[PDB]
């Protein structure tokens, strides 16, 4: 479809060129045979008139005719048709100057294909009806094609320059043609005087000659002059339309006068010029193609596609529960957030995973039941009513910042927020994150878990220490430094530091006077010598120092007796001292997968113990005083070096769990029936140890 890009002046000049070709061909075929001159010598040698006798043969007459055709006839009168032919062929070749160069031709084909495809697209009519399924996907594909066309054509302006060069060439050629044709049109005359010197042949010197085809050539010259003048007026109008309006800028304000959409950008250079071309064809294509340009139309189409694909019944199918017993909607890799999601009002938690370029409307005010929000690796935007409502209502937040900007800056305008899950990663310039130190606006924050490679605790935590209570940090091989920021914790109760590479327990933990629990997970504690100040943590009941490297346990454990939970699983402890079990309030003691050589008898002091795990130890001797402690509910002694299960084991009335898996035992005693809370599941052992109960004991044990 190349004729669409041709306005009225282009086809008018083309048909003028065909007329010029006809005139030139007619003039040429006249000049080939009809063009001849007739010459008679001058001063030749009831009234009866007598003819003058020139005494010349026919051959001499032809010779005179030739001499006068060559040396007396003006060159214009002989070569006018060939000049017309050459000039109109140059006009025809330059008529498609802006059509033939392959880059411009590709641009023309691309633009006309795009304009025709969106012309056939019903999304234009749908959008025009809105302002005043499969086809939605086709419209989206055509829109991204339009954006690619914008990135491919608008930045250049070669087509306009080629058009202006072609127009200027046509105008200057028309000026030349009018000038020389008007100058030499008087030379085409009938009667000419020929003064060749052929006196030595014919006998005469002065001749009067007649160009037989001079009237016809004059009429043809005037007709060609008229056609050239019309062609030049057409080209002058083309140049005037080129110059008096700036065609490097196409304005869609005339569309804006009746169409409400105002985000439409104004295209420039090649796009502007060739849209002006399509306007010259018919303005309907331009005012219709306007709707395919703006971006808010694409956003509206995306929202419509999301609403169509996600019926509320599909959301009922998607409804599930989460880790905090809330109604969760898992939305995975979505284009956006549908309003159908907000139509659900029973919803208690929102899960948005990598749904980026998303703006939260006021419609979330529909669902009042929200308590948790999962904004995972998604850059989210906001609206004023959404800020107000999520300030009033939202309390639990769980975001993942794969990218720093994928953390949105508006989490911190809230106040009702209580739980925060800051999973992700961080760079070297930790203190520059002003996003962290805006939680001063948060008043209700109580849970903070930051799985990130955080080396320096921010001053954010220092500010929010008054109301914060729980820390969970997974550095994953990153050293944590600058522990004064954890010193100025005051009201914190829980601290779970994982892989922080803390060589020693800082004075930060002892500056805490109300810490309920401490975790020093994956932290290389080679020695524990700073426990002297641990007495200041009177609230400390949990010391989960597991997978650690504590080589020996000193007397400093006597500083705190309020300790209840004690996890030293996989520790480097060799021999337990006499000084652990003085703290009788301990109930929950773990030494799982350690390598203790043996258990000394001072374990008898721990009566209020309810859990004693030493599994996978090298312990060959269990003295009977741990069997004397009857309050010991759980007692895990698995995979040690022990020999025989104690026959007087039924004395432990409150022995809920006895993990003695993989121990080298011989025969189970019959007094497991006296044990009230020990099962085959509880007494996990190898099966050849399970097969050892007496038959009546099997009858009493299968019935428990």
For ligand PEE, the binding residues (CB under 6 A) are 74-75, 79, 82-83, 85-86, 176, 180
Show contacts with other proteins in window 100-159 (CB under 8 A): 102
- 565-567 and 470-474 as β-strands: parallel, antiparallel, unpaired? unpaired
Residue 96 structure tokens: 């498609």
Chosen from other proteins, ligand PEE, none, partner binding at 83 (C-beta under 5 to 8 Å by type): ligand PEE
Chosen from other proteins, ligand PEE, none, partner binding at 33 (C-beta under 5 to 8 Å by type): other proteins
- 611, β-bridge pairs: 588, 634
- End-to-end CA distance of the chain, in Å? 91
Closest contact distance (angstroms) between CB of 181 and ligand PEE is 9
Chosen from ligand PEE, other proteins, none, partner binding at 180 (C-beta under 5 to 8 Å by type): ligand PEE
Q: Assess 365 for contact with other proteins (CB under 8 A).
A: no
Helices 134-153 and 123-131: crossing angle in degrees, nearest 10, is: 90
Nearer to ligand PEE, 178 or 242 (CB): 178
∠ CA 297-303-306, nearest 5°, is 140
Q: Assess 202 for contact with other proteins (CB under 8 A).
A: yes
* Integer Cα distance of 464 and 442 in angstroms: 8
SS3 per residue for 205-263:
CCEEEEEHHHHHHHHHHHHHHHHHHHHHHHHHHHHHHHHHCCCCECCCHHHHCCCCCCC
Nearer to ligand PEE, 82 or 654 (CB): 82
Segment contacting other proteins by CB under 8 A, of 37-45, 259-267, 316-324, 561-569 = 37-45
Q: According to CB under 8 A, which one of 201, 359, 404, 551 is a site residue for other proteins?
A: 201
Three-state DSSP state, 351: strand
Q: Assess 205 for contact with other proteins (CB under 8 A).
A: yes
Q: According to CB under 8 A, which one of 24, 27, 41, 81 is a site residue for other proteins?
A: 41
SS3 per residue for 635-655:
EECCCCCCCCCCHHHCCCCCC
Closest CA relative to residue 490, chosen from 517, 509, 471, 518:
509
Other beta carbons within 10 angstroms of residue 390's beta carbon come to 23
Nearer to other proteins, 71 or 440 (CB): 71
Closest contact distance (angstroms) between CB of 76 and ligand PEE is 8
Nearer to other proteins, 100 or 381 (CB): 100
Q: Assess 57 for contact with other proteins (CB under 8 A).
A: yes
Q: Assess 33 for contact with other proteins (CB under 8 A).
A: yes
Nearer to ligand PEE, 78 or 661 (CB): 78
Residue 76 structure tokens: 């214009």
Q: What is the size of the binding site for other proteins (CB under 8 A)?
A: 27
Q: Assess 428 for contact with other proteins (CB under 8 A).
A: no
Measured CA to CA in angstroms, residue 701 lies from 191, 322, 591, 675, 677 at distances of 146, 40, 30, 11, 12
Nearer to other proteins, 9 or 61 (CB): 61
Segment contacting other proteins by CB under 8 A, of 65-73, 231-239, 242-250, 587-595 = 65-73
Closest CA relative to residue 560, chosen from 539, 544, 577, 590:
539
Compute the chain's Rg from CA coordinates: 51
Nearer to other proteins, 19 or 89 (CB): 89
Closest contact distance (angstroms) between CB of 97 and ligand PEE is 16
Chosen from other proteins, ligand PEE, none, partner binding at 60 (C-beta under 5 to 8 Å by type): other proteins
Q: Assess 384 for contact with other proteins (CB under 8 A).
A: no
Other beta carbons within 10 angstroms of residue 52's beta carbon come to 9
* Integer Cα distance of 165 and 60 in angstroms: 55
Question: Dihedral of CA 186/188/190/191: which sign?
Answer: positive
Nearer to ligand PEE, 74 or 565 (CB): 74
∠ CA 311-314-320, nearest 5°, is 135
Sequence-distant (6+) residues with CB within 8 A of 398 are: 372, 373, 374, 375, 376, 419, 420, 421, 423
Q: Assess 199 for contact with other proteins (CB under 8 A).
A: yes
Q: According to CB under 8 A, which one of 3, 15, 45, 191 is a site residue for other proteins?
A: 45
Q: According to CB under 8 A, which one of 30, 40, 56, 92 is a site residue for other proteins?
A: 56
Closest contact distance (angstroms) between CB of 189 and ligand PEE is 12
Helices 295-309 and 134-153: crossing angle in degrees, nearest 10, is: 160
Closest contact distance (angstroms) between CB of 95 and ligand PEE is 16
Nearer to other proteins, 94 or 481 (CB): 94
Placement of tokens 């997974």 in the chain: 474
Nearer to other proteins, 200 or 346 (CB): 200
Segment contacting other proteins by CB under 8 A, of 41-49, 401-409, 574-582, 589-597 = 41-49
Closest contact distance (angstroms) between CB of 62 and other proteins is 5
CB 392 within 8 A of CB 415: no
DSSP code for 582: T
Nearer to ligand PEE, 79 or 222 (CB): 79
CB 561 within 8 A of CB 536: no
Chain-centre distance of CA 664, in angstroms? 62
Q: According to CB under 8 A, which one of 3, 32, 384, 429 is a site residue for other proteins?
A: 32
Nearer to other proteins, 238 or 615 (CB): 615
Nearer to other proteins, 208 or 514 (CB): 208
Segment contacting other proteins by CB under 8 A, of 66-74, 175-183, 416-424, 619-627 = 66-74
* Integer Cα distance of 240 and 231 in angstroms: 14
CB 634 within 8 A of CB 657: yes
Q: Assess 67 for contact with other proteins (CB under 8 A).
A: yes
Q: Assess 514 for contact with other proteins (CB under 8 A).
A: no
Q: Assess 687 for contact with other proteins (CB under 8 A).
A: no
Q: How many CA atoms lie within 13 A of 501 on its CB side?
A: 12
Closest contact distance (angstroms) between CB of 188 and ligand PEE is 12
Nearer to other proteins, 49 or 58 (CB): 58
Q: Assess 203 for contact with other proteins (CB under 8 A).
A: yes
Chosen from other proteins, ligand PEE, none, partner binding at 230 (C-beta under 5 to 8 Å by type): none
* Integer Cα distance of 171 and 87 in angstroms: 13
Nearer to other proteins, 163 or 204 (CB): 204
Burial class of residue 373 (count of CB atoms within 10 Å of its CB; 0-12, 13-18, 19+): buried
- 372-376 and 634-636 as β-strands: parallel, antiparallel, unpaired? unpaired
Chosen from other proteins, ligand PEE, none, partner binding at 41 (C-beta under 5 to 8 Å by type): other proteins
- For other proteins, the binding residues (CB under 8 A) are 32-33, 41, 43-45, 54-60, 62-63, 66-67, 70, 79, 102, 199-205
């Amino acid at each position: 479809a190349f004729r669409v890009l041709k306005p009225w002046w282009d086809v008018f000049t083309d048909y003028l060129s065909v007329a010029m070709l006809m005139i030139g061909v007619f003039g040429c075929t006249l000049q080939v045979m009809q063009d001849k001159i007739i010459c008679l010598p001058k001063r030749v040698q009831t009234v009866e008139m007598k003819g003058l006798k020139t005494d010349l043969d026919l051959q001499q007459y032809s010779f005179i005719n030739q001499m006068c055709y060559e040396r007396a006839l003006h060159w214009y009168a002989k070569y006018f048709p060939y000049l017309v032919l050459i000039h109109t062929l140059v006009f025809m070749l330059c008529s498609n100057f802006w059509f033939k160069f392959p880059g411009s031709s590709s641009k023309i084909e691309h633009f006309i294909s795009i304009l025709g495809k969106c012309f056939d697209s019903p999304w234009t009519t749908r959008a025009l009806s809105e302002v005043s399924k499969k086809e939605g996907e086709q419209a989206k594909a055509l829109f991204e094609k339009v954006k690619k066309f914008r990135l491919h054509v608008e930045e250049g302006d070669i087509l306009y320059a080629m058009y202006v060069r072609q127009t200027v060439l046509k105008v200057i050629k028309f000026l030349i043609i009018i000038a020389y044709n008007s100058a030499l049109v008087s030379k085409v005359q009938f009667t000419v005087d020929c003064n060749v010197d052929i006196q030595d042949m014919t006998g005469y010197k002065n001749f009067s000659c007649n160009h037989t085809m001079a009237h016809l050539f004059s009429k043809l010259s005037f007709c060609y002059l008229c056609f050239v003048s019309i062609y030049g007026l057409t080209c002058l109008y083309t140049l005037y339309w080129l110059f008096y309006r700036s065609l490097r800028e196409y304005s869609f304000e005339y569309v804006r006068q009746e169409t409400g959409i105002d985000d439409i950008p104004d295209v420039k250079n090649d796009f502007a010029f060739m849209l002006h071309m399509i306007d010259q064809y018919d303005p309907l294509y331009s005012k219709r193609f306007a709707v395919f340009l703006s971006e808010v139309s694409e956003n509206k189409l995306k929202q419509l596609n999301l609403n169509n694909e996600w019926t509320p019944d599909k959301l009922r199918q998607k409804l599930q529960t989460n880790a905090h017993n809330r109604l969760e909607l898992p939305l995975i890799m979505l284009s956006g957030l549908p309003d159908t999601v907000f139509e659900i009002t029973e919803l208690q938690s929102l899960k948005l995973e990598i749904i980026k370029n998303v703006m939260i409307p006021a419609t979330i005010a529909q669902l009042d039941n929200l308590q948790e929000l999962c904004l995972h690796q998604c850059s989210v935007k906001i609206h004023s009513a959404a800020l107000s409502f999520l300030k009033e209502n939202l309390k639990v937040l769980s975001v993942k910042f794969d990218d720093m900007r994928e953390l949105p800056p508006w989490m911190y305008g809230l106040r009702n927020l209580e739980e925060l899950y800051l999973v992700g990663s961080l760079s070297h310039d930790i203190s520059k994150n002003v996003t962290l130190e805006s939680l001063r606006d948060l008043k209700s924050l109580k849970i903070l878990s930051i799985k990130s490679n955080v080396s320096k605790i921010p001053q954010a935590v220092v500010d929010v220490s008054s109301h914060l209570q729980k820390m969970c940090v997974h550095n994953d091989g990153t050293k944590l430094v600058m522990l004064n920021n954890l010193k100025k914790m005051t009201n914190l109760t829980e601290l779970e530091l994982v892989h922080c590479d803390l060589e020693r327990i800082p004075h930060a933990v002892f500056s805490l006077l109300s810490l309920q629990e401490l975790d020093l997970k994956e932290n290389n504690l080679k020695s524990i010598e700073e426990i002297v100040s641990f007495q200041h943590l009177r609230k400390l009941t949990v010391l989960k120092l597991w997978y650690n490297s504590i080589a020996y346990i000193p007397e400093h454990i006597k500083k705190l007796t309020s300790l209840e939970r004690l996890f030293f699983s996989h520790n480097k402890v060799e021999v337990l001292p006499s000084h652990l079990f003085l703290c009788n309030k301990i109930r929950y003691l773990d030494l799982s997968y350690n390598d203790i050589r043996f258990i000394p008898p001072e374990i008898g002091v721990l009566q209020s113990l309810q859990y004693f795990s030493i599994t996978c130890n090298k312990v060959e001797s269990l003295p009977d005083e741990l069997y004397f402690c009857k309050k010991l509910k759980t007692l895990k002694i698995g995979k040690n070096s022990l020999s025989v299960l104690s026959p007087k084991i039924g004395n432990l009335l409150f022995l809920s769990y006895l993990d003695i898996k993989g121990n080298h035992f011989e025969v189970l005693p019959p007094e497991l029936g006296d044990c009230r809370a020990l099962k085959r599941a509880g007494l996990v052992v190898e099966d050849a140890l399970f097969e050892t109960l007496p038959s009546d004991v099997r009858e009493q044990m299968k019935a428990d």
